[PDB]
Design an enzyme around this catalytic site. Structure first.
Site, mmCIF file in Angstrom:
data_model
loop_
_atom_site.group_PDB
_atom_site.id
_atom_site.type_symbol
_atom_site.label_atom_id
_atom_site.label_comp_id
_atom_site.label_asym_id
_atom_site.label_seq_id
_atom_site.Cartn_x
_atom_site.Cartn_y
_atom_site.Cartn_z
ATOM 1 N N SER A 155 75.287 34.555 116.527
ATOM 2 C CA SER A 155 75.317 35.269 117.796
ATOM 3 C C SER A 155 75.338 36.791 117.555
ATOM 4 O O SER A 155 74.398 37.329 116.960
ATOM 5 C CB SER A 155 76.465 34.740 118.619
ATOM 6 O OG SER A 155 76.284 35.123 119.967
ATOM 7 N N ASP A 195 70.151 27.578 125.144
ATOM 8 C CA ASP A 195 70.855 28.798 124.832
ATOM 9 C C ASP A 195 70.053 29.913 125.493
ATOM 10 O O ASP A 195 68.849 30.000 125.269
ATOM 11 C CB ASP A 195 70.941 28.965 123.314
ATOM 12 C CG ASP A 195 71.626 30.225 122.796
ATOM 13 O OD1 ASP A 195 71.967 31.109 123.610
ATOM 14 O OD2 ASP A 195 71.850 30.296 121.575
ATOM 15 N N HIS A 214 74.421 27.234 122.580
ATOM 16 C CA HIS A 214 74.920 28.388 121.871
ATOM 17 C C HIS A 214 76.293 28.062 121.302
ATOM 18 O O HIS A 214 77.119 27.472 121.996
ATOM 19 C CB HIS A 214 75.000 29.572 122.843
ATOM 20 C CG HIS A 214 75.265 30.858 122.151
ATOM 21 N ND1 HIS A 214 74.248 31.578 121.568
ATOM 22 C CD2 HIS A 214 76.400 31.564 121.999
ATOM 23 C CE1 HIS A 214 74.774 32.668 121.043
ATOM 24 N NE2 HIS A 214 76.086 32.657 121.271
HETATM 25 C C1 LIG Z 1 76.251 37.381 121.991
HETATM 26 O O1 LIG Z 1 75.922 38.778 122.206
HETATM 27 C C2 LIG Z 1 75.723 39.106 123.471
HETATM 28 O O2 LIG Z 1 75.784 38.301 124.361
HETATM 29 C C3 LIG Z 1 75.528 40.578 123.666
HETATM 30 C C4 LIG Z 1 76.622 41.381 123.336
HETATM 31 C C5 LIG Z 1 76.590 42.744 123.522
HETATM 32 C C6 LIG Z 1 75.454 43.337 124.014
HETATM 33 C C7 LIG Z 1 74.366 42.561 124.371
HETATM 34 C C8 LIG Z 1 74.366 41.183 124.195
HETATM 35 C C9 LIG Z 1 73.109 40.503 124.659
HETATM 36 O O3 LIG Z 1 72.913 40.156 125.800
HETATM 37 O O4 LIG Z 1 72.157 40.490 123.722
HETATM 38 C C10 LIG Z 1 70.877 39.844 124.026
#
Ligand SMILES: COC(=O)c1ccccc1C(=O)OC
Ligand SMILES: COC(=O)c1ccccc1C(=O)OC
Length: 299
Positions: free
Chosen positions: A149, A243, A273
């Site tokens: 992630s 996801d 996810h």
């Molecule tokens: C899992 O990471 C996230 O969900 C995220 C975190 C911080 C900024 C952006 C994101 C995001 O949406 O990326 C695609």
């Protein structure tokens, strides 16, 4: 659309404050999962790496039997806001013992207390440390970076920065990474609610991590935007079918492939996810076996 995995379906059907409380709740969740499906015993040693943004705690995992000639450096997920070395112990202990690799799990600085791009810098600096130490562990100096992630975001960015930072990287392992903070994809639109990682949360995470909304287009936030992927490290890109981040992960794998990067792209059907830190699902171990089989091909 393949049917949800039965166990996933049950887990979601049984699903039911302050930043500190939220972080504690995330840690308690990880603990319960580990109680349900205990990790393998593994020798560990804790330490601290001096980075350009401060000390960063690490934990080194030593396999019973060393079978892989590069250190792994692992960056945990949790939206840049949650998680630590303990929350991801279940995954890392298994990577270590199954691959037969030394693994460095990294406790990078969390948002909002630290903002983008502080953890990127920290994660580079730890990778560099690992490359320097590797010969003294009887290993090759080129490292394998890995993350889930938000951690997969960090692994992907460290990988893009590596040649410029004189950092030898042998491979990148991206587990359902966040890669594009700018574009909506079909998966991000269509699986945004009800599959554990939700739109509202992603937005909130962005608000904690980024300095301003303009940071979404920064190449160290959105590595998927980089137009030249040639010469990047061999990539294993694991996605979950249901996801929101699926489509950006698979598109990045397609782009790597077309740029001549040796790339294995594996979608786990019926999964959500986070599944590689959820040992109630046998797919977590299947994905770790995929890691071992991919890494067999690196040397
Ligand atoms: C899992 O990471 C996230 O969900 C995220 C975190 C911080 C900024 C952006 C994101 C995001 O949406 O990326 C695609
Ligand atoms: C039975 O529920 C518990 O209190 C529990 C205990 C250990 C591991 C996991 C769990 C669990 O699934 O929580 C809901």
């Amino acid at each position: 659309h393949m049917p949800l995995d039965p166990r996933v379906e049950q887990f979601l059907a049984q699903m039911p404050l302050s930043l500190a409380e939220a972080r504690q709740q995330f840690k308690q969740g990880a603990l319960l999962l580990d109680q349900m499906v205990p990790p393998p015993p593994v020798d560990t040693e804790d330490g601290t790496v001096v980075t350009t943004h401060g000390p960063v705690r690490i934990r080194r995992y030593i396999p019973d039997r060393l079978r892989f000639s590069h250190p792994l450096v692992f960056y945990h997920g949790g939206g840049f806001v949650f998680g630590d070395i303990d929350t991801h112990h279940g995954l890392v202990a298994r990577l270590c013992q199954t691959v037969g690799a030394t693994v460095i799990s990294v406790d990078y600085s969390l948002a909002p207390e630290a903002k983008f791009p502080v953890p990127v810098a920290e994660c580079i600096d730890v990778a560099r440390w690992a490359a320097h130490e590797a010969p003294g562990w009887g290993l090759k100096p080129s490292i394998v970076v890995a993350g889930d992630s938000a951690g997969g975001n960090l692994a992907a960015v460290v990988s893009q920065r590596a040649k410029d930072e004189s950092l030898p990287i042998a491979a990148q392992l991206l587990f359902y990474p966040a890669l594009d903070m700018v574009h909506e994809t079909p998966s991000k639109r269509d699986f945004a609610r009800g599959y554990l990682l939700e739109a509202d949360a992603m937005q909130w995470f962005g608000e904690q991590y980024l300095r301003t909304p303009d940071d979404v287009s920064h190449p160290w936030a959105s590595p998927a935007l980089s137009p030249d992927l040639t010469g990047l490290p061999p990539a294993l890109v694991i996605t979950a079918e249901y996801d929101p981040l699926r489509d950006e992960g698979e598109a990045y794998a397609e782009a790597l492939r077309a740029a001549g990067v040796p790339t294995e792209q594996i979608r786990f059907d019926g999964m959500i996810h986070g599944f590689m830190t959820m040992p109630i699902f046998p797919q977590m171990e299947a994905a770790i076996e995929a890691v071992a089989r991919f890494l067999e091909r690196i040397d």
